[model samples]
Target: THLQGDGLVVLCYHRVLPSSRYAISRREFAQQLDYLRQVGVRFVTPQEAEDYLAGRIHLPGKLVLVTFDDGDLSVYRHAFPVLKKRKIPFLFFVIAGQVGRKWEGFSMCSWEQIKEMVASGLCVVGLHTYDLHYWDSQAKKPVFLLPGRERLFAEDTARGTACLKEHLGLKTRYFAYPYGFGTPTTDEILRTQGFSLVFTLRAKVNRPGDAPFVGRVLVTPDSWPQVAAWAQA
Candidate 1:
């Protein structure tokens, strides 16, 4: 059976490029939004999501919070227009230190593009991390999970928050763990970093009183089949 009952189903997306395996075509993305609506899934604004998660509000079933990871220009060039036209609100989680620069072969989003989205009142900015977005093969774990890096992780966390404050002029309470590899230690670190709502790659519907580390459905080229199952079942 598909998801039912009262909870939020956050859809997580990364790059919106044309070719990456993780990417889905722009037209397809739009159609997915339409299909979700057909299934009675209402797209939620970032503020509404914040309020619901903070126990300040409640939502009916199949409510969705759209979120993206990694600050890439493709989002500004592709996804932004579609969501903006429909007046849908979304969350963009950024790699705080990599703004405006190329990283790992992808063109990153600049402050100018990010600011424009913010100004449109349709996008909410969140933090991904300062520099830990990859796996540490030698360490046999994601970079953030490497042992004895607690202080380093905290320092990086501070750097990310500082970067956003300097550029976006706000202390963001939302965070997404890079590679979705957060643990108990990392969770506590984020609490101290002042974040209350966090998103991860966990695929499930969120109900009230769930853990602070929120789960999300990652969207990709091959996600439609499963999405349809969730929506139609």
Candidate 2:
């Protein structure tokens, strides 16, 4: 398993469905939260994460930042209620262009659902990109990685920022790469786009002195055992 927390372990999840290969059931998700509490894992908010990363606050111990990517409807339907009742703070990263749409295999969150979650005061929406989370088949890579498509990449991201601002009235400053393998160039672009922190699916805990682009440990139904076992330590 990857390293456990000494600072912050950003728990990244997607769907909250039993059938989805990467998703955990609603029960398992609840159990995982209880287990973390049982193991003395202290849940921290994204704001606290920012403060810690900025050296403005000292974390007590075993800190984690719960985050959900893709803005899946299950996140709203299943995870939100549990987290709301538990008063747990988490970051929900939305695909700006995909909101309110029922895709081929999964459904995205409606703006109303997202607003309700935000009104609950425990959820913060982070940007996952406007529509850049997927690769451009013809380009053979993420457009951000294309040499001459920098303008294209920037426009897409700025559009997402605007989209979020218009929809949620949030001038959001946090981001997560859609594919989890963003480069420094992308980093600078996002920073210029007003993002202060960025997350990567690097499966490691974060401590101070790390860059603003922090590593997030992904959690999936199949990988729960390992993650849970590691949390026990």
Candidate 3:
């Protein structure tokens, strides 16, 4: 593993499904969990990651912080049990608008499922940009843009954070930029909102003191072990 002070690897994921077009299929997902178990890899929490980077949290020989994005129901139906069975703790970054709005064709999680996951003591819920800002569902194009990219980002993120705080009954501390895009003002706004860490979808694991504004990687079936390997790298 690449050495760069005392930092932790944070793995990101989108959906967990049996045979989804995107995200990891159920079989591959199980294999990934099994691989981690067999390799003796440990999952760290968001706070633990923060402390580890700050030299306040001590872990075993190796540590990786597991996180998910979009709060897809596949996690509840498929991934949650595996993580629970493995006794691994993880963080779930959820978009605010998707919660409690599970209608047909949405493929998001209900509030109750998220509540159960959190109550299970195996998962922690974080923020995943409440309003689905960077999504171009109709256009099928990459929606990531800088500050001037769109005004919807700021509006959506601000509302999303507020709604998440209200629904989750917890202060939103961690944020993953929508579409792995951000700007100085947005970053500063997130920081002022009390977000200690933010992730962007990029290769290579984060070293200590890495930029706190980017998003995180979205792990799929193809990048199972590679996700962990990259995080450690």
Candidate 4:
């Protein structure tokens, strides 16, 4: 059986590049969107998804929320055009301090580009935390979830939220954990900080009154068919 009843399915995408193994080709990405539409999955904005999950609004039986992580430049060069052409709304979670910066060899969109996107009314910018995108060398995992780092995590969240407001000129209640890593304390901290929604890579459908942590299905070119099948069924 596939997903049914009133619920939301969020597809999480990282990079959208042609050569990167972690990314998907442009053609495949377009196909996925078309498949979703053909299957009657209504796309909702990040805000709408939060409202539906929070019981603040009535959601349809089949809903889809599109999200992108890491603010990769490929999103601006490739995915943005497709989404713009189709007039699809999406959430882009970014490392607040990394705008206009490059990670490894992949460049990130400058603040100018992001501002233009926000003005388009199709992109909702969310925080992916500040400076916590890297791994803890000793822990071999995300630093935000490292033990005894509560203060660090809180500080990072505060800084990132502030950056989002200062740069984007908006207050965001949505957050996505870097690499989908979080702990109970992390959830507690986010709730206390006024975040209404938190996204993770848990790969499931979301219903109303569920936990603040929303599960998302990661999609790549080859694996998108499986996600499409699940959403369609």
- Taken over the whole model, the C-alpha lDDT of each candidate is 0.83, 0.85, 0.68, 0.85
- TM per candidate comes to 0.94, 0.93, 0.81, 0.94
lDDT score, residue 45, model 2?
A: 85
How far is each candidate from the true structure, as Cα RMSD in Å? 1.7, 1.7, 3.6, 1.7
lDDT by residue (tens digit), candidate 3, 86-197:
7778888887787766623546778889888888887878777766555566665436443354465567667877787677787877888656656676677677777877
Best by TM-score: 4
**Residues 18-113, candidate 4, lDDT per residue (tens digit)?**
888579877888888988898888999988888889878876678889899988888888998889988899999998788899976788888888
- Per-residue CA lDDT of model 1 for 1-233, tens digit only, reads 13555578788887776787678788888888888878777888877777776667865566788898999888999999989888889999999899999988889989999999999988889999888888887877778888898888899889999998999898888999887768889889999889978888877777766646688888864655766677665
TM-score of 2: 0.93
State how far residue 176 of model 1 sits from its true place (Å): 0.6
- Candidate 4 has a TM-score of 0.94
For candidate 1, list the clashing residue pairs, or say none: none
Question: Once superposed on the true structure, which residue ranges of model 4 sit more than 4 Å away at CA?
Answer: 1-6
**What TM value does model 1 have?**
0.94
